[PDB]
Design a binder for this molecule. Structure first.
Ligand code: HEM
Ligand code: HEM
Ligand SMILES: Nc1ccc2ccc(CNCCCc3cncc(F)c3)cc2n1
Ligand SMILES: Nc1ccc2ccc(CNCCCc3cncc(F)c3)cc2n1
Ligand SMILES: C[C@H](O)[C@H](O)[C@H]1CNc2nc(N)[nH]c(=O)c2N1
Ligand SMILES: C[C@H](O)[C@H](O)[C@H]1CNc2nc(N)[nH]c(=O)c2N1
Ligand SMILES: [Zn+2]
Lengths: 413, 408
């Protein structure tokens, strides 16, 4: 691979030089003959697979603290090596755990919010042994991160994988999501995205209220055991009623959303160690709710209803009635969050911050891996600066990874 | 292997086998994706390329290994062997041009690919000849508002010093002028080209929408200036169906998008001059040409007239102005009965096209970065469509600006 790759911004003429890509650790899925950049997704480590993975991370950590090659560096390498030799795994120091989590975020090529990567509260939950304990840790995370609306980014890290039959998993895809209910007539109530999971919860004993915005219970698996249900204390779940500054009728649509986006089904990989339960949270970019959650045809799908209330000509597509209503819905989401003083960022501010972030990273780090397909917001693409910015996508470690859904793999006891 | 692409909204899964045909590189490697990077002969090189193309031509008319096929291979072979090049048959030229369109991964309009009027201009020898051919192209393709896709193909490259080139990036474009006060009048994209026309003798009206003259290079000679007869230049005054003040912005655009700076490659042969044209998807003008900061950059002016609050970005005043502008462009073209397609209709057809291509051809190379419209991405079906990008020949390729290589 060439040592220096250039990226250009076509609106500002700024050229950046990437050297960081040489540190790339795994496959994108592309080859020299095909690009899979728009494909969404293109038994434990042996002792021999683990050794170089840990060394690579340890070196990286000690290089970051300006102690590379020090006595403490070499001692730590020695102690890790002996641990792997005698136990076939190793345990991270708290310093290393914190460094690794922050860097997994810093490395997440699909995240537009990474300017914030160094301000991450890390909660070490590696002493957790039961599902009740996972619930306690999760409740504390939710309360801290919510902070009465002044949201603070955070991650809670549960014990790492051992033999793969004792995994800790949060079965929820996010800590807070709304239920979906398939009706006998084919219609869906609530969020169609969560139908499968909702069904699982109901089978496990959950009594469904069967409303349009029912917060799902936690389904929590500890140490490879069967998962257990828990209700999050409603006072810990901050929600925002969606209204519009001009359209008095908008509140009558009865929409609302939850304040805290908290992804809980990803796998955190550090120095070859696998943390299968690592729920993390930041705050929302408005479009995630106003465009995707609300306007996707396979989601709440509200465009028509809003358009009819806006008295739009909906007979031709070329009236852009869909686009017109889409903007108003997004205005409503930002207005409603700001008004209730719940942190949220619009797609202009967020993409402008990311450009500055990217430039700084190129300067101090020699690059910034970025997935343009994900970074460009789902509305108004080209009137945000990221649209015009060439990006290189590659995979650095530590990293957040996808993992199979737990009900697909769980061995029921 | 076989590659699956999934649409996440419809759950439809397609299987790509067509990609096994590509031999050209994408730029990505196993470890680094360059999906958002805008831009990542000899006898010995020539024949296998010629043979490849002749082979797929005869496979497409279902006469592979036929007497005609065999004879054509030997004929081309002899001709390369004796002249360092060869000439395509008319049938092959047409097949080649339609297939370059079909293989253009960045083009959302490909459902039309087999409807392409091909104008063979390989007998052309002078810039005056080129002008005549271009005028006829524009007249044919414009068709009084009922636009028809067309391509005009000039002689292929020989030694690299006798290239035919249309120096204009599109056949019809608006000039751009650098003002004393450091601002730009007209289209800032064309400031450099405009200056070259001026330096060559073009007398600029110095307005906002001055149609540039044609600058045409035949056989490697210096380029020459020509004014396209105005009656051949269809233009649309932009107005809004609700905001009657919109026409007071004085905005207009031309009906015919005719890209003239690309290189058409067929069977190893390079056609450095091949202006082609279709019709507009509305966002090209309403989002990119009008609202790009580096282009006409009108958002702020429009937003003012709409009396929006422009203090905070989170009011989405920009997004609001963007939609109204795009509504106007579509309404104007439609009202003047000039062909145009909105991004909903276009992306819809593209999905149907993909479905067609997978069934009959085994796939469809597609560049999600280009296919997804620059506004309202996820409310169009292509946003939710996984696509595989790969390079098939015949193809349209980029080439350097003539002013950076030409000696006078
Ligand atoms: C602090 C404010 C943050 C903002 C504004 C933000 C913004 C975003 C957005 C808009 C996406 C696209 C998600 C989608 O379309 O589904 C995303 C993806 C992502 N974010 Fe961030 N984020 C933030 C914090 C975080 C944190 C704290 C982490 C981890 C510690 C993180 C890691 C990721 C990852 C791994 C993805 C890719 C998710 C996937 O592939 O499904 N983000 N972010
Ligand atoms: C007939 C109606 C057509 C429509 C609606 C259409 C639509 C589009 C659009 C919107 C783009 C993106 C352009 C940009 O953002 O700069 C594009 C790209 C492209 N189109 Fe089409 N197009 C049409 C006809 C054609 C024809 C007739 C050809 C060639 C014979 C063609 C070949 C291409 C190529 C090569 C690109 C890539 C341009 C580049 O890489 O710079 N298209 N098309
Ligand atoms: N505001 C934030 C911050 C961090 C985030 C991290 C992750 C996410 C959500 N990514 C969800 C995509 C999951 C998915 C996987 N496969 C197919 C899909 F359609 C969707 C949203 C975030 N939002
Ligand atoms: N409606 C159509 C049909 C075919 C088209 C074919 C091409 C185009 C314009 N492509 C623009 C590429 C110019 C460019 C390339 N690389 C970097 C740049 F900054 C600018 C527009 C079309 N519009
Ligand atoms: C097929 C395509 O890759 C898929 O729909 C992607 C496109 N870009 C995205 N970008 C973000 N931020 N989130 C998404 O879910 C998607 N979906
Ligand atoms: C940096 C990025 O590749 C560049 O801005 C691309 C993005 N997608 C595009 N898509 C289209 N249709 N046209 C373009 O000019 C671009 N520009
Ligand atoms: Zn790629």
């Amino acid at each position: 691979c060439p040592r220096f790759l250039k990226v250009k911004n076509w609106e500002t003429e700024v050229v950046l030089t990437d050297t960081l890509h040489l540190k790339s650790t795994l496959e994108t899925g592309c080859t020299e003959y095909i690009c899979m950049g728009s494909i969404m997704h293109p038994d434990v480590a042996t002792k021999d697979q683990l050794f170089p993975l840990a060394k690579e991370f340890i070196d990286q950590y000690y290089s970051s603290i300006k102690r590379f090659g020090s006595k403490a560096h070499m001692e730590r390498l020695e102690e890790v090596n002996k641990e792997i030799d005698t136990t076939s795994t190793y345990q991270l120091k708290d310093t290393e755990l914190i460094y690794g989590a922050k860097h997994a975020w810093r490395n997440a090529s699909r995240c537009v919010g990474r300017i914030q990567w160094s301000k991450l509260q890390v909660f070490d939950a590696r002493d957790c042994t039961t599902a009740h304990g996972m619930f306690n840790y999760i409740c504390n995370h939710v309360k801290y991160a919510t902070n009465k609306g002044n949201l603070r980014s955070a991650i809670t890290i549960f014990p790492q994988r051992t033999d793969g039959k004792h995994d800790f998993r949060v079965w929820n895809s996010q800590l807070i999501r709304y239920a979906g209910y398939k009706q006998p007539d084919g219609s869906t109530l609530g969020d169609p995205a969560n139908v499968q999971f909702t069904e699982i919860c109901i089978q496990q004993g959950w009594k469904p209220p069967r409303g349009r915005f029912d917060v799902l219970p936690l389904l929590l698996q500890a140490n490879g055991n069967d998962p257990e249900l828990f209700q999050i204390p409603p006072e810990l779940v901050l929600e925002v009623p969606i209204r519009h500054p001009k359209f008095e009728w908008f509140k009558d649509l009865g929409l609302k959303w939850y304040g805290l986006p908290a992804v809980s089904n990803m796998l955190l990989e550090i120095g070859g160690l696998e943390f299968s339960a690592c729920p993390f949270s930041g705050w929302y970019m408005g479009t995630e709710i106003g465009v995707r959650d609300y306007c996707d045809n396979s989601r709440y799908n509200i465009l028509e209803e809003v358009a009819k209330k806006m008295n739009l000509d909906m007979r031709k597509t070329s009236s852009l009635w869909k686009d017109q209503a889409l903007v108003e819905i997004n205005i409503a989401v930002l207005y409603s969050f700001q008004s209730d003083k719940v942190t949220i960022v619009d797609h202009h501010s967020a993409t402008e911050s990311f450009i500055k972030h990217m430039e700084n990273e190129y300067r101090c780090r020699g690059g910034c891996p970025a997935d343009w397909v994900w970074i460009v917001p789902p509305m108004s693409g080209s009137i945000t600066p990221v649209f015009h910015q060439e990006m290189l996508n590659y995979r650095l470690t530590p990293s957040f990874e996808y993992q199979p859904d737990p009900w697909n793999t769980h061995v029921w006891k």
